[PDB]
Design a protein around this ligand. Structure first.
Ligand SMILES: CCCCCCCCCCCCCC(=O)SCCNC(=O)CCNC(=O)[C@H](O)C(C)(C)COP(=O)(O)OP(=O)(O)OC[C@H]1O[C@@H](n2cnc3c(N)ncnc32)[C@H](O)[C@@H]1OP(=O)(O)O
Ligand SMILES: Cc1nn(C)c(C)c1CCOc1c(F)cccc1-c1ccc2c(c1)c(CN(C)C)nn2C
Ligand SMILES: [Mg+2]
Length: 382
């Protein structure tokens, strides 16, 4: 409708037909040197996530105050080591871990982050940032703190000479460049139904539901194994080639591919397929992100795996994704989550995913381009 903060920003208007490609406003040769002012009694604090205490403050802020589902029944519970993986990739900067503290008690009440990313958007590649983990404490909601955090990260990114950003959100803002539905594949239906993430079809009993969701105990594809250090270059080569077919994608160096894919227990899993010749031809990956089951007496945490990047050249994608489900089930996950981006629509129904109840919107800051279908979005943010 109208957007008091967003209408002031270099982004297209909702329902502006965009034909051109490029920035919304010219690049700045003078940047504001003073931080934006917070309301009385609050202060900025850049968070040193290498200090275990401070990282545990951020873990607690997000565990108590970050994204919930539409029913206010589940809340993300990013672990401390996951936060390090997501917030310290190659090129991370300390001033881009932007905290807000109560001056008197020092309590952490706000956060926003930027990390650097090279982004391929249609026929342009540009150095941008990815914005994530914007959070204001429940007690501070609806006081227009969020646009101060957004302006302040913007200023800190401008100081580094960067004028574009990419970000996702559940809410509709001016103006999505793509819209993706999330979908969910049940791995432990009795639990999912007990905690009311899922319901039992009116037309299926529990016994039938367990059989419907049952998977084999070991993956089908020959030569599947975890990614090792020797696979970093071929994973990088495969992913670079595979991404060319999408219109919004990252461009990762070999060091960024090692950061984002080399396995870390309970954070990131990557498995490659190594054929009879010793060549790696395919890989699957998914990250670990549990959700707190709010106010529930029994089950406290929902264990969820999320589809990350899956590259196929010799193994059909259908089988690579069946493999990912099997591996997730083996590792104790309750549910396997995926978006309808890249070629995912080719497998979601076939593999018994059910559609969820919302959208994840994709956005660029200060770049106008035409919007794209979900199938052409080739970028996954944590
Ligand atoms: C060149 C560099 C550029 C870098 C910057 C690029 C842009 C980055 C943008 C950030 C990308 C974030 C990526 C992620 O992390 S998405 C994850 C966002 N986090 C959560 O959903 C956690 C739970 N919720 C919260 O912590 C608060 O509800 C948040 C902080 C989300 C809003 O706090 P609060 O509810 O207390 O609101 P307010 O009164 O202070 O502010 C109201 C204003 O804020 C606009 N709003 C509300 N939600 C969002 C949102 N998710 N993206 C952008 N704008 C949002 C809203 O339309 C209104 O603007 P307008 O309608 O008046 O215009
Ligand atoms: C389980 C569960 N626990 N909670 C607390 C929720 C919301 C679910 C639903 C999770 O739905 C997704 C999925 F199935 C696959 C891929 C992405 C998602 C998703 C959706 C909305 C999302 C995100 C990520 C992110 C994280 N980041 C910015 C991408 N922010 N918001 C607003
Ligand atoms: Mg607020």
């Amino acid at each position: 409708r109208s957007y008091q903060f967003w209408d002031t920003q270099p982004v297209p208007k909702l329902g502006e037909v965009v034909n051109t490609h490029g920035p919304v406003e010219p690049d700045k040769d003078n940047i504001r040197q003073e931080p934006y002012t917070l309301p009385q009694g609050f202060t900025w604090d850049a968070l040193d996530l290498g200090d275990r205490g401070v990282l545990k403050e951020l873990y607690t802020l997000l565990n108590e105050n970050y994204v919930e589902d539409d029913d206010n029944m589940f809340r993300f519970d990013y672990s401390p080591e996951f936060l390090l993986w997501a917030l310290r990739p190659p090129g991370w900067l300390p001033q881009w871990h932007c905290g807000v503290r109560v001056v008197s008690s020092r309590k952490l009440v706000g956060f926003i982050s930027a990390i650097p990313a090279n982004i391929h958007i249609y026929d342009t590649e540009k150095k941008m940032v990815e914005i994530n983990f914007l959070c204001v404490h429940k007690k501070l909601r609806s006081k227009r703190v969020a646009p101060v955090l957004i302006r302040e990260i913007t200023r800190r990114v401008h100081l580094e000479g960067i004028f574009q950003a990419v970000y996702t959100a559940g809410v509709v803002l001016p103006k999505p460049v793509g819209t993706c539905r999330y979908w969910h594949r049940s791995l432990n239906p009795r639990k999912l139904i007990e905690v009311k993430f899922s319901h039992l079809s009116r037309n299926m009993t529990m016994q039938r539901t367990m059989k419907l969701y049952r998977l084999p105990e070991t993956p089908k594809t020959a030569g599947l194994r975890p990614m090792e250090t020797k696979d970093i270059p071929v994973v990088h080569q495969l992913l670079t080639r595979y991404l060319k077919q999408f219109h919004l994608t990252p461009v990762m160096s070999q060091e960024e591919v090692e950061h984002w894919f080399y396995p870390q227990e309970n954070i990131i899993d990557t498995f490659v397929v190594e054929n009879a010749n010793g060549e790696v031809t395919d890989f699957l990956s998914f990250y670990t992100l549990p959700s707190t089951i709010m106010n529930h007496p029994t089950h406290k945490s929902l264990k969820a795996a999320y589809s990350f990047y899956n590259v196929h050249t010799q193994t059909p994608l259908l089988d690579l994704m069946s493999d990912a489900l099997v591996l997730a089930k083996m590792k104790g996950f309750d549910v396997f989550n995926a978006l309808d981006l890249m070629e995912n629509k080719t497998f979601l129904e076939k593999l018994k995913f059910g559609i969820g109840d919302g959208n994840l919107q994709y956005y660029l800051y200060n770049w106008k381009c035409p919007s794209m279908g979900a199938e052409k979005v080739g970028l996954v943010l944590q």
